[PDB]
Write a protein that binds this DNA or RNA. Structure first.
Ligand SMILES: [Mg+2]
Lengths: 744, 171, 180, 71, 57, 83
RNA sequence: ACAGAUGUCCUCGAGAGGUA
């Protein structure tokens, strides 16, 4: 269990809810196929969004049993995992499948380092295994070369643009077509596929899709949404969507912290009994719910401030909270030295905001736009307060105490660390200290603005990068009250450009012959950007893999020249994958809009591949723009199964309709306003919980063990609309008078 | 095949409804509870007849709390999947596993080793169906199914059917 | 939920008998001569598929007039049958009762007999024999052509060997069902 | 969070004027302050009682919230 | 009376003031009355379940 | 079995019966349950129970079990309360 | 892609000395 999960469970305990996973009955050896049209015990669900990376990644190269066969085993595992998730959630309106693709230049800074660290770990473990076999062979035993050559799955090879992504995308389409054809309950379900060709990080695609579904006047505000992902920030990102009917599904990491991890050798000691018990135990994986509707009430009861010149708005209150949480920690910028734990600093930042809010005469952020003087005052107050936090952290570290090593020599607890911290990154020169401080201030402000725009109003630069490795220390951004931030739109990177900007190590061989020849040659124009020994590992507090790299950045112009030089001699078949592509929408044979789609597109009109159809959410759902498919799909045809050894029956094209889906362009800026006609959920909170969250509780102090206990006693929480009227009865009369009479 | 029985259900009425209309309260409770219940011992309680006839007895007040338990005596139509008989049903789903034949409020499943070897799965036609010589079953078709399943009555009942031997087809 | 008092050492009889097979061998609770609520010694009913549809329809209309008068005091072929059944079920039972629609549709689209006189004739014809009500219910529910087909589809019918009266009342059932 | 926690205090006014004790548990507005000579616990308002130093020194009122420190 | 027990060789209990972070399963009583050595100086008023001797293992 | 109305127990209320009815009525009034008398400014459930029992306005039935197993039902209103 | 801690009560069989 992560520290963030523990923090959110301690501060907000009721957000943890139990799940109801159906177990199909087994009679006479056979397995009863579970129904899909039956009512879901976990409440009605309409929209489900799934990050396909979060399923294809754990299935491949797992920590218990690596797939012994070829990619086929991983494909079967991800197919059964997706089937289990679909049966658990049971979407009724639209099911969304998205996998990571092209990402903006800011993401390469940390993704490249993570991939290189993983590759180095794989290389060193392979060397250790080779040494183990060499020592074992000295005794006299003989091991087949197949076992020795049976290396890992090369997790670094899973990158957008590789043929593995294309093979996975081809398999996914067949799987969803088979599911739509063979399941009568999928008649109204609509499935979209966002392959690795489509740019996005997996979650930003979901944000764009939900803002495009909210880009229609007739969109129902009462629709429920579910997003499944293992990322910790996923539960936090869904709050920014301003959708009360939201809940996050994820695996129960509380049990998985100390789950079954015994060695395979012990599985044969007791023969049938122990193996049967083990296979029964791991067959069921508990999950949990991360409802956001309840969390909105907790945030409302925790962000209240008495006395304010402006008007307290719940929608605007969450904006400052999400901006501050992103500032404290995100996967786009280096961690602030002051905010390292990222858990205990949240309350300090919140009370700083509470004490500075009366001084300010305006809100923190306005629809993603950061108020420059207000944020300047906030960071000035934090820097004034950061001294006490730094002193307490140093005292705690000293009490606890009682690969380059850089932070140890800094000795931040001693007075005068302002230049001592910067000496670990640059030379000992006075004016250079000020120059680097100003540059870091400008870069950090630009990065904060860029991440706010990306997570609120979508991508705005697509090429911005962070040209630094160490975040500025406390009392930063002293004078910056004159800069104006205005980002420029840039074209997304090509799949090959993004793949080489990820910069896999020499172990990776997903590149074609030309690119690997241009790399492996000792006299390479970009050989300086590709280390071999990788000695850039550096601790900087923390431990284990949490250390960051210090390798030099990559110049975009050199990589562009390299790709433009390698392009002309590449084969046309391989170059055919350079197309950005568009998401593909799949609908059932008996869909409400199926007749209209079959009469408009792929019909007797026989237009020259330029007719598009725009439809609203009044009929069926999934508002958007559909276009002619660019693949080989055609009416009265057949689709070849790519799984091969999967015993999957072939299907015809008359059962599944395939077309290219394009999101509706945003007319105006995506504001944060609750849509009219939204029906609030049932009132579940009590004033006691409001007081509990208003008073500062030191993790409940373990006075009565209220943190952990009858967790299952919280039961399920009702979801969906509750009551025709969207306004709670306050004073008034008639209906409110009758309610008061029946209550009192 | 449906049976008319004389079942009994115990309802623990709360003292908050100990008024002149507690009888009608028990009546509506019995309706809202017994209907749609998939009891393992009996099956489905489709409907309760003679609503204005069912009688209640003196409710015994429990020693623990003031709630009173009433032993009602109702009669209703009960459907049980049973075992060892032929029955007619209508398909509602089809897949490689089998066809989901529906008889009344039931969904009897047929596995691979149940039907004879004269059925092969294919998706060439508009409905995904098992097609072979002189056998035509589809999403909506007539089929006679013989039940030989173990039911497995655990808070709900099920059924497994067979297609072996003649007369178990469309006809 | 039970209707029969404990007897014949129910506590620890272990496996008294295997579950009901094709050759009759009824269950412990569904045995003949059930205990009547008011008295005792009540035989099991002989209810067929067509009889079930009429019985449930009669109960529905009885409850319909019941709560219709209560609220008043307080204040083609298959196509026509489906609409009438839907409009009757929309408010009579209330609640959810999803399974009621499916069984009503099954009764309507598989109604062997659609007249009170027809079902009266068929059960007055079937009461002549001493067969188990389970056997007569299946005989009157599923139409049959040959004697061997009836024996195979409906087992535990080996007591009839002559097959002359069996052919006679099979033809009677066939013409009654075609007289719908 | 609360300043009045483990700091020696002197009870003012009421029937325990001039008494010396240490506040152990504080909740809401009432503060539970133990007694040195007497083996009993008395709950009084935190504002009423003055605040002293653990080692010894001048006494101050509840203005410790502004100072956010001791002494 | 309190004592230090030498479990094994290097697993020996020590008299010191415990903290909520490094140590685990602390008592519900207060610990401010303790000193650096883990022993309360004479002349300090105590009541209830206050900790007088601070030992960790 | 129930002895019709040829009952042969005592036409009065025993002390144990009085205690049991008083306790049951007190619990029922303590929970949200209807009261069939005029509270008249009483707010203790036990006293409300005694007030209800004063004019025999308690809708409770006593089932006196014979040692063999038979039982006869006695209404509260028909039971004489002399103790 | 991802991921470093906490939940409140421990004796148990005996022995001895006493109180109503
Ligand atoms: Mg992420």
């Amino acid at each position: 269990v992560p520290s963030f999960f523990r923090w959110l469970s301690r501060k907000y305990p009721k957000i943890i809810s139990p799940v109801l996973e159906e177990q199909p009955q087994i009679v006479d050896g056979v397995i009863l196929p579970l129904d899909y049209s039956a009512s879901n015990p976990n409440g009605e669900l309409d929209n489900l969004y799934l990050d396909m990376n979060g399923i294809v990644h754990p299935c491949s190269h797992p920590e218990n049993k690596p797939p012994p066969e070829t990619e086929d085993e991983m494909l079967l595992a991800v197919f059964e995992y997706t089937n289990r998730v679909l049966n658990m959630a049971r979407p009724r309106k639209v099911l969304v499948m998205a996998v990571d693709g092209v990402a903006p230049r800011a993401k390469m800074n940390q993704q490249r380092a993570r991939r290189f660290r993983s590759a180095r770990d794989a290389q060193i473990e392979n060397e250790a295994r080779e040494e183990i076999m060499r020592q074992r062979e000295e005794v006299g035993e003989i091991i087949d070369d197949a076992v020795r050559n049976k290396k890992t799955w090369d997790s670094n090879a899973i990158t957008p643009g590789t043929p593995f992504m294309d093979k996975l995308a081809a398999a996914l389409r067949y799987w969803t077509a088979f599911k739509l054809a063979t399941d009568p309950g999928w008649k109204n379900l609509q499935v979209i596929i966002s392959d690795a060709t489509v740019p996005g990080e997996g979650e930003h695609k979901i944000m764009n899709f939900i803002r495009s579904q909210r880009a229609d006047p007739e969109y129902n505000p009462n629709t429920t949404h579910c997003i499944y992902g293992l990322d910790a920030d996923l539960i936090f990102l869904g709050l920014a969507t301003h959708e009360p009917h939201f809940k996050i599904l994820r695996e129960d990491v509380f049990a998985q912290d100390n789950r079954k991890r015994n060695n395979l050798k012990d599985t044969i000691n007791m023969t049938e009994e122990e193996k049967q018990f083990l296979q029964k135990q791991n067959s069921e994986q508990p999950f949990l719910w991360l409802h956001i509707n309840v969390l909105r009430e907790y945030l409302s009861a925790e962000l209240w401030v008495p006395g304010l010149p402006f008007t307290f708005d719940l929608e605007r209150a969450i904006d400052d909270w999400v901006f501050m949480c992103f500032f404290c920690g995100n996967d786009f910028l280096p961690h602030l030295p002051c905010l390292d734990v990222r858990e205990n600093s949240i309350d300090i930042l919140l009370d700083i905001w509470k004490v500075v809010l009366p001084k300010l005469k305006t809100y923190m952020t306005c629809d993603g736009v950061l108020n420059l003087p207000s944020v300047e005052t906030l960071l000035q107050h934090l820097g004034s307060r950061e001294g006490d936090i730094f002193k307490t952290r140093h005292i705690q570290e000293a009490r606890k105490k009682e690969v380059f090593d850089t932070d140890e020599f800094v000795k931040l607890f001693e007075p005068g660390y302002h230049e001592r911290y910067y000496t670990a990154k640059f030379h000992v020169t006075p004016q250079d200290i000020e120059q680097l401080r100003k540059d870091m201030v400008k870069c950090y402000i630009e990065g904060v603005a860029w991440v706010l725009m990306y997570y609120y109003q979508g991508c705005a630069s697509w090429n911005w990068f962070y040209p630094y490795h160490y975040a500025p220390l406390a009392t930063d951004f002293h004078g910056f009250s004159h800069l104006e931030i205005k980002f420029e739109e840039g074209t997304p990177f090509l799949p090959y450009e993004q793949l080489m900007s990820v910069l896999p190590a020499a172990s990776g061989h997903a590149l074609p012959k030309i690119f690997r020849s241009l790399m492996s040659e000792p006299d390479s124009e970009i050989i300086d950007f590709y280390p071999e020994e990788f000695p850039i590992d550096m601790n900087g507090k923390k431990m284990s893999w949490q250390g960051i790299a210090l390798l030099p950045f990559i110049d975009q112009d050199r990589l562009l020249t390299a790709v433009r030089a390698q392009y002309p001699l590449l084969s046309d078949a391989e170059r055919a994958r350079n197309i950005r592509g568009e998401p593909v929408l799949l609908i059932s044979n008996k869909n409400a809009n199926y007749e209209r789609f079959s009469k408009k597109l792929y019909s007797k009109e026989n237009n020259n591949n330029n007719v598009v159809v725009k439809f609203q959410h009044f009929k069926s759902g999934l508002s958007g723009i559909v276009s002619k498919d660019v693949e080989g799909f055609e009416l009265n045809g057949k689709i070849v199964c790519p799984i091969q050894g999967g015993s999957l029956p072939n299907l015809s094209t008359t059962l599944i309709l395939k077309m290219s889906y394009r999101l509706i362009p945003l007319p105006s800026r995506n504001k944060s306003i609750i849509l009219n006609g939204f029906i609030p959920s049932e009132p579940v909170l009590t004033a006691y919980d409001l007081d509990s969250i208003m008073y500062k509780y030191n993790n409940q102090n373990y006075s009565r063990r209220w943190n952990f206990g009858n967790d299952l006693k919280q039961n399920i929480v009702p979801v969906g609309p509750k009551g025709i009227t969207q306004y709670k009865p306050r004073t008034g009369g008639y209906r409110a008078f009758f309610y008061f009479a029946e209550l009192s | 095949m449906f049976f008319i029985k004389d079942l009994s259900l115990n309802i623990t009425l709360h003292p908050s409804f100990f008024g002149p209309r507690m009888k009608q309260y028990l009546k509506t409770k019995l309706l809202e509870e017994v209907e749609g219940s998939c009891t393992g011992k009996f099956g489905y309680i489709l409907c309760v007849l003679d609503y204005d006839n069912i009688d209640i007895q003196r409710g015994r007040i429990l020693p623990t709390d003031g709630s009173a338990e009433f032993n009602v005596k109702y009669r209703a139509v009960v459907f049980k999947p049973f075992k060892g008989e032929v029955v007619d049903g209508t398909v509602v789903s089809c897949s490689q596993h089998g066809f989901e034949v529906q008889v009344g409020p039931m969904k009897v499943f047929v596995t691979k080793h149940l039907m004879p070897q004269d059925l092969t799965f294919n998706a060439g036609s508009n409905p995904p169906s098992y097609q072979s010589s002189e056998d035509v079953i589809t999403i909506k078709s007539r089929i006679r199914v013989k039940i030989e399943g173990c039911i497995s009555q655990v808070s709900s009942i099920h059924a497994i059917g067979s297609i072996k031997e003649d007369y178990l087809g469309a006809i | 939920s039970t209707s029969t008092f404990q007897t014949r050492r129910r506590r620890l009889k272990k496996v008294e008998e295997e579950e009901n097979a094709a050759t009759l061998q009824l269950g412990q609770e569904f045995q003949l001569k059930q205990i009547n609520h008011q008295g005792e010694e009540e035989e099991l009913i002989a209810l067929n598929l067509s009889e079930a549809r009429l019985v449930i329809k009669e109960a529905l209309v009885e409850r319909r007039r019941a709560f219709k008068r209560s609220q008043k005091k307080h204040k083609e072929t298959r196509e026509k049958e489906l609409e009438s059944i839907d409009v009757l079920l929309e408010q009579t039972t209330g609640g959810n009762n999803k399974d009621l629609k499916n069984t009503m549709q099954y009764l309507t689209n598989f109604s062997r007999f659609r007249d009170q006189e027809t079902v009266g004739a068929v059960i007055q014809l079937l009461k002549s024999t001493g067969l188990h009500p389970f056997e007569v219910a299946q005989l009157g529910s599923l139409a049959c052509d040959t004697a061997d087909e009836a024996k195979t589809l409906i087992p535990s019918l080996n007591n009839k060997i002559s097959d002359d009266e069996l052919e006679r009342i099979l033809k009677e059932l066939s013409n009654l069902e075609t007289l719908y | 969070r609360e300043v009045a926690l483990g700091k020696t205090v002197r009870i003012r006014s009421a029937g325990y004027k001039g008494q010396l004790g240490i506040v152990k548990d504080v909740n809401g507005d009432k503060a539970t302050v133990e007694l040195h000579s007497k083996n009993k616990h008395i709950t009084i308002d935190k504002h009423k009682l003055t605040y002293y130093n653990r080692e010894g020194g001048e006494g101050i009122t509840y203005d410790e919230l502004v100072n956010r420190r001791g002494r | 009376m309190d004592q230090e027990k030498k479990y094994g060789m290097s697993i020996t209990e020590t008299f010191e003031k415990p903290q909520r972070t490094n140590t685990l399963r602390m008592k519900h009583g207060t610990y401010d009355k303790l000193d650096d050595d883990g022993l309360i100086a004479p002349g300090v008023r105590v009541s209830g379940e206050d900790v007088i001797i601070g030992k960790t293992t | 079995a129930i002895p019709k109305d040829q009952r042969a127990t005592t036409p009065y209320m025993t002390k144990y019966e009085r205690a049991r009815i008083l306790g049951t009525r007190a619990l029922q009034i303590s929970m949200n349950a209807p009261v069939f008398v005029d509270l008249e400014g009483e707010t203790d459930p036990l006293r409300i129970a005694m007030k209800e029992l004063a004019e025999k306005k308690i809708p409770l039935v006593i089932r006196r079990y014979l040692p063999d197993g038979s039982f006869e039902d006695w209404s509260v209103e028909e039971l004489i309360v002399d103790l």
